[PDB]
Nucleic acid binder design. Structure first.
Ligand SMILES: [Cl-]
Ligand SMILES: [Cl-]
Ligand code: NA
Ligand code: NA
Length: 325
DNA sequence: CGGCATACG
DNA sequence: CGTA
DNA sequence: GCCG
């Protein structure tokens, strides 16, 4: 089992679901405490289990696996022996974890803001509502729409949304295309947001596109909230006899950069962090959603496809369905 | 020990 | 600071 | 927390 998540296929569903979920609780809790190193380790150990071809039933199966040291191994050991890990359960029922999870789930609220509110004694969404002077307009929208945004988006919803985005994009710039990215491109049947990448086949025609797209969607009454080339919005999505708020991200890239933007925005988040870490540390190349830079030659690799990018990094190609690290 | 992805709004 |  |  190779050390980086980008070196192994990771399917969306797998054979170690409970073990990985437990490790991810500890990762999440480390993040709430600002411990990014520990968050990464627990994320990586969880991902290794997702990549295994069968269930871990015995502690000896962890031998030789990367990212399993004393701590992650003890978590697995306790789950195998008793069905539960005392540390994980202590985190789950803790006021700190529950409140930081609740607050960071709000659109517009990150760990730092959540922690500040926690320290001020705030605990519930109604606590935040009672103090609107404490909120940015983005947070106010996140809080008003929190219930809808907590509901899973279905792939059927995604397809209806794509047609609407395509219509606006087509008027903004005929010939421009819309590609579904994010978790849905990785095969998810449900999700909490929808990501689209927009380009045009004629290099440079994409300049200034996103404001034209957003103005048109706003004119159609589809935008509940928006605040350039990336837009993090809340859209009005039809439902039987009503509608609901959905998080939608829109990103524009020049066609020259499209494979890099597609790769970046397809995720998963851990997959992309691992891939960029691999590129820099193992290959000495610097990867982002715009390109892949050789800092010695001072040149950019001109990729025509995601397959090109994997080849240039010396990695076996993984389709989006196997990037669920 | 140092390092942990890398951008844009 | 937030977002991915 | 773990790797190199
Ligand atoms: Cl840490
Ligand atoms: Cl980027
Ligand atoms: Na080990
Ligand atoms: Na948030």
């Amino acid at each position: 089992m190779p050390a980086y998540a980008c070196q192994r296929p990771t399917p969306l569903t797998h054979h170690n679901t409970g073990l990985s979920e437990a490790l991810e609780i500890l990762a999440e809790a480390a993040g709430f405490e600002g411990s990014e190193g520990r968050l990464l380790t627990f994320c990586r150990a969880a991902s290794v289990l997702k990549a295994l071809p069968s269930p871990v039933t015995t502690l000896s199966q962890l031998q030789g696996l990367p990212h399993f040291g004393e701590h992650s191994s003890r978590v697995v050991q306790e789950l195998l022996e008793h069905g539960v890990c005392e540390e994980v359960e202590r985190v789950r029922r803790s006021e700190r974890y529950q409140t930081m999870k609740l607050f960071t789930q709000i659109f517009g609220v990150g760990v730092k803001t959540a922690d500040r509110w926690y320290r001020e004694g705030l605990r519930t969404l109604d606590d935040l509502r009672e103090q609107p002077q404490k909120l940015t307009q983005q947070q106010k929208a996140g809080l008003q729409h929190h219930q809808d945004l907590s509901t899973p988006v279905l792939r059927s919803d995604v397809d209806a949304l794509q047609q609407v985005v395509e219509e606006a994009v087509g008027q903004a710039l005929p010939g421009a295309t819309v590609t579904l990215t994010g978790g849905f491109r990785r095969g998810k049947l449900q999700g909490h947001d929808v990501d689209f990448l927009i380009t045009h086949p004629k290099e440079g025609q994409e300049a200034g596109l996103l404001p034209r797209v957003m103005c048109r969607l706003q004119d159609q009454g589809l935008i509940l909230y928006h605040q350039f080339e990336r837009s993090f919005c809340i859209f009005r999505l039809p439902q039987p006899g009503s509608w609901k708020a959905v998080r939608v991200d829109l990103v524009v890239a020049p066609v020259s950069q499209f494979p890099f933007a597609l790769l970046g925005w397809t995720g998963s988040k851990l997959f992309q962090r691992e891939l960029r870490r691999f590129s820099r540390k193992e290959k000495g190349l610097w990867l982002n959603s715009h390109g892949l830079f050789d800092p010695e030659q001072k040149t950019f690799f001109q990729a025509a496809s995601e397959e090109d990018i994997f080849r240039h990094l010396g990695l076996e190609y993984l389709p989006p369905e196997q990037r669920n690290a």
